[PDB]
Design a binder for this molecule. Structure first.
Ligand SMILES: Nc1nc2c(ncn2[C@@H]2O[C@H](COP(=O)(O)OP(=O)(O)OP(=O)(O)O)[C@@H](O)[C@H]2O)c(=O)[nH]1
Ligand SMILES: Nc1nc2c(ncn2[C@@H]2O[C@H](COP(=O)(O)OP(=O)(O)O)[C@@H](O)[C@H]2O)c(=O)[nH]1
Ligand SMILES: COc1ccc(CNc2c(-c3ccccc3O)nc3ccc(F)cn23)cc1
Ligand SMILES: [Ca+2]
Ligand SMILES: [Ca+2]
Ligand SMILES: [Mg+2]
Ligand SMILES: [Mg+2]
Lengths: 440, 424
């Protein structure tokens, strides 16, 4: 047991679920049709991979997940794509009409038409579970469904499942791939209404991922397929502690104890290494010290901020592959003397380490190199508040003139919600400043 | 007084507790399935203290194995000596305790404790004369810490006249699962001060340093630390497990070691430290056991004073030489033993050595320098608690800030009390 249910909302959520679930299937040797040769226990089992996959009596391993979107085009491609047999048709849920880049339609108007159906299906998966750990919610900040349906869902999930843990992987909007002028409004509304209901939230900055694809993978103009393949690697590093056995494997909840010092401070910065092309990885084995060092290079981060001009409250290293504790300790010793790492005066400065032996894998016909070892750093730094600040400034520019506000008010929202949400983010920015101030 | 009932709680509790049963089962000639293939009658003479006799002359450890998750306890059953434990005494929950004291003490563990007490009562009843209970646990996680101290409180209620022993593993940043350890430890120390007669303080700081500095293990595992723990546990139970003049029991130990009831935190020590070929002379054992480098608690005994001492020599050796050497360190370092408890060092010798060594020494000290341990944990605690950091994990299971304040105060009082006798 310790089962984990994934919920994928809107286009970004859906397309990242594909990347993720395609990746998890390759990681565990599960074929497209759902069969898993190396699983001798047919119909069920207690194995670590069973946290993400139920078994049917016919030998089908089936994702503990639900894809939800308010229009059929993105989910229709899962219904007819390589992995169509993997999912039960009732896990793939669509409406007829989207939220149209409007938090309000996603939360109220189009959203309340499909919400009972979504909870009903989430419930059907929850009852296949002998000891459900919690949910993982994948969604964009900027979309209408991703922002407003997710918020509605999170609220409702807190009611049906109490305090059962809820993690978010949230896509933070970037101008290179942005689809709507109103993304800053959607972002601040979802962030605000989700903050009491989420226990931990990994932000992914599309720009950060966009820059990494250009710089490290030599990709001239990355598509979503390029970004999601990189994201799934990061997601996989984080969930790998849930999906694999291991002597040196620290569970993800144990990292969370360290990552979240107050309920509102639940936004860890992730950083992944190595991201390298096959061309460049040939005759170029990257040691534990090199990838560990790469975690403190802020070009390898998932969110554009500078931890060097801020303070750490935690630092977790999730290694996978050919890694042993000795090399890790030596690598950390080198970094402590040679790099810009200042903790707040109320945290202990120890780095928490976890190691999975299963080395990372790559999706066929991708841009990443297959490497012998890899690492995801999860840090809690005050620097991440930079990301809130940039986004809060864009919100303030538009909100001062009331640009676009009529589109939200027409679907039933009030001006009160906007300023209530912005003050919550003002307070959150002030919280991230307070934690960094030294004690007396 | 013979029968002891052993309980092991949580990851650490069950890991070290498994090694203890491995070590002493070899010493008493019991094999991985439970049969006696020994040679000396001295091996079976007080086998009753820790083992029950079963159908077919099998010996079954009087051991209750407790955890809130089945991870560690499936490993114990998998491991070398697992098949010896009575299968009804495996009592386990499903969801674990997430290194949270509150979950162990107040919510998750509360659900499970009454089942553990039914096995305790089962083992307690088929005992000729129960002397007491020993618990193995760490103070830093949530099950062995919080649930463990909940058990202790319940056992004291039902058996208020029996002795309570702990082997309590104190935490260190040098070997650290989570930032909340100082919180968990401070909540458990508050329990231990009130509800135990004796506690062996195994500091993981001290085990790491012995492993690093004195044994040349650059990257020490929990296996390397537990090697040191089970040799210390073997040593401080020798006098209960073997003969033959010392009618040593847990109550006698409590009476002679503990001049003031709250000051029952013992610093253990072992010589020689291992992981040899040249056997040690009695002078060397006597220098080594008293050395700071050989203490299982990270405290300089020169910074404090010894209230009482109990030393236990194992092997064939001259008792003349053992008295001479034990009297030499007292006479040559007399400032470090309190003048107001005459003859506070008591020494014993047992002919059977442990596996591997021809001769060895185990030290049990109630030193006032133990305060340094509680000061170290008090400091780590305050660093965080002054900004109420990480508290939401505890307040979400119904605990209040006042309960942390209380606990911080009891420990700081303990420290004051130890400091009181260092200067008297
Ligand atoms: N990383 C990544 N970002 C995406 C993907 N698809 C869309 N986005 C980003 O997500 C934001 C737009 O939200 P979507 O998820 O398309 O919108 P939606 O939730 O479907 O909402 P509506 O379409 O308005 O109902 C923009 O910031 C896009 O760049 C994807 O596959 N990967
Ligand atoms: N010496 C030693 N310490 C341990 C062992 N296992 C865990 N610890 C320590 O115990 C503390 C964590 O407690 P743990 O027993 O895992 O938690 P619980 O299962 O929730 O009681 C930390 O200080 C760890 O360093 C072990 O086998 N030996
Ligand atoms: C002032 O110190 C003491 C006086 C009396 C006792 C009672 N029994 C005991 C013990 C002892 C008792 C219980 C468990 C383990 C033990 O190793 N070890 C010795 C060694 C020498 C001796 F004279 C008695 N010992 C303990 C300490
Ligand atoms: Ca199976
Ligand atoms: Ca329960
Ligand atoms: Mg859409
Ligand atoms: Mg642990």
């Amino acid at each position: 047991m310790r089962e984990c249910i994934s919920i994928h909302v809107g286009q970004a959520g859906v397309q990242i679920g594909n990347a993720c679930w395609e990746l998890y299937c390759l990681e565990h040797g599960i074929q497209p049709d759902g069969q898993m040769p190396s699983d001798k226990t047919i119909g069920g089992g207690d194995d670590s991979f069973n946290t993400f996959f139920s078994e049917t009596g016919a030998g089908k391993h089936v994702p503990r997940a639900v894809f939800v979107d308010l229009e059929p085009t993105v989910i229709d491609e899962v219904r007819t794509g390589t992995y169509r047999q993997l999912f039960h048709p009732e896990q793939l849920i669509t409406g007829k009409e989207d939220a149209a880049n409007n938090y309000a339609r996603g939360h109220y108007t189009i959203g309340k038409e499909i919400i009972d159906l979504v909870l009903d299906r989430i419930r059907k998966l929850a009852d296949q579970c002998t000891g459900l750990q919690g949910f993982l919610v994948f969604h964009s900040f900027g979309g209408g469904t991703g922002s407003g349906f997710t918020s509605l869902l999170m609220e409702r999930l807190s009611v049906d499942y109490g305090k059962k843990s809820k993690l978010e992987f949230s896509i933070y909007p970037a101008p290179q791939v942005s689809t709507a002028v109103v993304e800053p409004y959607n972002s601040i509304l979802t962030t605000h209404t989700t903050l009491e209901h989420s226990d931990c939230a990994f932000m992914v900055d599309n720009e950060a991922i966009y820059d990494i694809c250009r710089r490290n993978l030599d990709i001239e103009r990355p598509t979503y397929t390029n970004l999601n393949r990189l994201i799934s690697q990061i997601v996989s590093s984080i969930t790998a502690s849930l999906r694999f056995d291991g002597a040196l494997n620290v569970d993800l909840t144990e990292f969370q104890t360290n990552l979240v010092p107050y309920p509102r401070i639940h936004f860890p910065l992730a950083t992944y290494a190595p991201v390298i092309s096959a061309e460049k990885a040939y005759h170029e084995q990257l040691s534990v010290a090199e990838i560990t060092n790469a975690c403190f290079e802020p070009a390898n981060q998932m969110v554009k901020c500078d931890p060097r001009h801020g303070k750490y409250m935690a630092c977790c290293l999730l290694y996978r592959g050919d890694v042993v504790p000795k090399d890790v300790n030596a690598a950390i010793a080198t970094i402590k003397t040679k790099r810009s790492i200042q903790f707040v005066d109320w945290c202990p400065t120890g780095f928490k380490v976890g190691i999975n032996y299963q080395p990372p894998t790559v999706v066929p016909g991708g841009d990443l190199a297959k490497v012998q070892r890899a690492v995801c750093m999860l840090s809690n730094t005050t620097a991440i508040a930079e990301a809130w600040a940039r986004l809060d400034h864009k919100f303030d520019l538009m909100y001062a003139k009331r640009a676009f506000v009529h589109w939200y008010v027409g679907e039933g929202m009030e001006e009160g919600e906007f300023s209530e949400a912005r003050e919550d983010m003002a307070a959150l920015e002030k919280d991230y400043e307070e934690v960094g101030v030294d004690s007396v | 007084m013979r029968e002891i009932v052993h309980i092991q709680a949580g990851q650490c509790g069950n890991q070290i507790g498994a090694k203890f049963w491995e070590v002493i089962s070899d010493e008493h000639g019991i094999d991985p399935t439970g049969s006696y293939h020994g040679d000396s009658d001295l091996q079976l003479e007080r086998i009753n203290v820790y083992y029950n006799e079963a159908t077919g002359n099998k010996y079954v450890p009087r051991a209750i194995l407790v955890d809130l998750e089945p991870g560690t306890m499936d490993s114990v059953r998998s491991g070398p000596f697992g098949q010896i434990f009575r299968p009804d005494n495996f009592v386990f929950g499903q969801s674990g305790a997430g290194n949270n004291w509150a979950k162990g003490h107040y919510t998750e563990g509360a659900e499970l404790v009454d089942s553990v007490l039914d096995v305790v009562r089962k083992e307690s009843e088929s005992c000729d004369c129960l002397q007491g209970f020993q618990l193995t646990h760490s103070l830093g996680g949530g099950t062995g810490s919080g649930m463990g101290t909940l058990l202790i409180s319940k056992i004291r209620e039902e058996y208020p006249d029996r002795i309570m022993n702990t082997f309590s593993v104190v935490p260190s940043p040098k070997v650290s699962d989570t930032v909340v350890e100082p919180y968990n430890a401070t909540l458990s120390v508050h329990q231990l001060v009130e509800n135990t007669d004796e506690t062996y303080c195994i500091d993981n700081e001290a085990l790491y340093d012995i492993c690093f500095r004195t044994l040349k293990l650059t990257t020490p595992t929990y296996g390397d630390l537990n090697h040191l723990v089970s040799a210390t546990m073997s040593g401080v139970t020798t006098c209960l497990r073997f003969p033959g003049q010392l009618n040593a029991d847990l109550r006698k130990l409590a009476v002679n070691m503990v001049p003031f009831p709250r000051l029952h935190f013992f610093m253990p020590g072992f010589a020689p430290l291992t992981s040899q070929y040249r056997a040690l002379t009695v002078p060397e054992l006597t220098q080594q056991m008293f050395d700071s480098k050989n203490m299982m608690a990270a405290c300089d005994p020169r910074h404090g004073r010894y209230l009482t001492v109990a030393a236990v020599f194992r092997g064939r050796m001259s008792m003349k030489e053992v008295d001479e050497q034990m009297l030499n360190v007292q006479n040559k370092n007399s400032s470090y033993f309190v003048e107001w408890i005459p003859n506070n060092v008591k020494t014993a010798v047992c002919d059977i050595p442990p596996r591997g060594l021809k001769m060895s020494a185990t030290f049990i000290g109630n030193s006032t320098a133990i305060q340094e341990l509680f000061k170290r944990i008090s400091e780590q605690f305050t660093a965080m608690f002054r900004r109420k950091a990480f508290l939401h994990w505890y307040t979400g299971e119904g605990m209040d800030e006042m309960e942390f304040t209380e606990a911080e105060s009891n420990m700081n009082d303990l420290v004051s009390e130890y400091q009181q006798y260092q200067d008297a």
